[PDB]
Each structure stands twice: as C-alpha cells, then as structure tokens.
Amino acid sequence: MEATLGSGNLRQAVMLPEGEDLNEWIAVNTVDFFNQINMLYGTITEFCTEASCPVMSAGPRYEYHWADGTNIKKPIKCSAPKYIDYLMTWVQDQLDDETLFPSKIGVPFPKNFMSVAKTILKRLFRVYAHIYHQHFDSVMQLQEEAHLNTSFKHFIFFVQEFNLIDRRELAPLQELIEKLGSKDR
C-alpha cells in the first residue's frame, strides 16, 4: 500500500533503541499510538454517530460492549461513539496515572506495567478495527487513507515486535495484517 509522504522505515522504527529500557520504550510507543488514533478518529467523528453506529463493532460478528472492571463492571452495549469515548477516556486516565506511567525518574515502572500496557494496546486496536470496517468510505473521501494505513502498519509492527496482543484479538483485521510489509520473495 501507499505510505504517507512523511513516514519512514516502520520496521526499524519499532525496534528497541540500543541502550533504552523496554518498559520505557513500550510506554513511549503506547502514548504515541493513543495520539495517532485520537488524531485519526477525530477526523471522522461527524460520520460516526448514534444513528450510523448503534453498537460498537468491527463487522457484524465482532461486537464490543464496554466495561473496565472498576467504574463499569456490567458490560455496556452502547453506540460506537460512546464506546470509543469510554475507551479513549479510560486509556488517557491510565497514561496520566503517575503510578503507572511515572513522571519522575526516581520512580520505577510498576510490576503490572506490561499487563496495563497490553490492555491499553488491545483496546486501542478496536478503534482501528471499527474505523476500517465502518468508516473507510469517509477516510477515502478525506483522501487520508495513507495516514490510516501507515498508522495501522506502524501499530501492528510495534505489537508484533514485542508480542503485545494475542492473534485472536486481532481477528477483525487479520487479513489486512497478513498483507502488511512484504515477502522478499
């Protein structure tokens, strides 16, 4: 596919820089994908409504109901816009949590960091899946497909590099994922 005009080599971009800490690298990248997705979803919010998306899905057979096991335990079957708002607000709350993503160098990453990072990442994946399945038309109208595709490719190379999401969670975009990159024959 076509990459954005300003993108670089994504396979190299996701590798852990020599001398850098793994937890910190995942933290920096996770913050970045949250921003990339926030940016992309923002461009199509007027096309993702209560009426266009009465439920959160990535194709009919993959429906998502929101729950975070703390504030909301009983899964909520809401519209995509509300589901994504719940989701992104939840991810942002984790990112702003000083005990999870330490703002001070004298504070180590918590023991459950990786687990929290993986949970964030698997959830962010769902926004890409909904966008591709329900709004690729609006993406094409804005002529921003390169941005969505490059961001998604970057995201997938990153999670594959560190095995951060299990294959099964990626089901709705597995075909696309298998097409990413290329066999050198």
Which residues are at the interface with Zn ion (CB under 5 A)? Answer: 48, 53, 80, 134
**163 CB-contact burial (10 Å; exposed 0-12 / middle 13-18 / buried 19+):** exposed
Closest distance between Zn ion and the C-beta of residue 78, in Å?
A: 12
Residue 78, annotated as binding a ligand = no
Q: Which CB sits closer to Zn ion, 80 or 164?
A: 80
Q: Are 21 and 102 a contacting pair, CB within 8 Å?
A: no
Residue 147, annotated as binding a ligand = no
How far apart are alpha carbons 25 and 79 in whole angstroms?
Answer: 33
Burial letters for 7-46: b for 16+ Cβ neighbours within 10 Å, e otherwise?
Answer: eeebeeebeeeeeeeebebbbebbeebbebbeebbebbee
- Beta strand ranges found along 42-135 (DSSP E): 56-57, 63-64
Residue 65, annotated as binding a ligand = no
Q: Which CB sits closer to Zn ion, 10 or 80?
A: 80
Residues 6 or more apart whose Cβ sits within 8 Å of residue 158: 14, 29, 33, 164
Closest distance between Zn ion and the C-beta of residue 144, in Å?
A: 16
Q: Which CB sits closer to Zn ion, 46 or 178?
A: 46
Closest distance between Zn ion and the C-beta of residue 134, in Å?
A: 5
Q: Which CB sits closer to Zn ion, 53 or 156?
A: 53
State the residue number with the nearest CB to Zn ion.
Answer: 48
Q: Which CB sits closer to Zn ion, 53 or 173?
A: 53
How far apart are alpha carbons 111 and 128 in whole angstroms?
Answer: 28
Question: Rounded to 5 degrees, what are φ and ψ at 63?
Answer: -110, 145
Closest distance between Zn ion and the C-beta of residue 44, in Å?
A: 8
Detail the residues annotated as belonging to a binding site. Answer: 48, 53, 130, 135
Detail the residues annotated as belonging to a binding site for Zn(2+). Answer: 48, 53, 130, 135
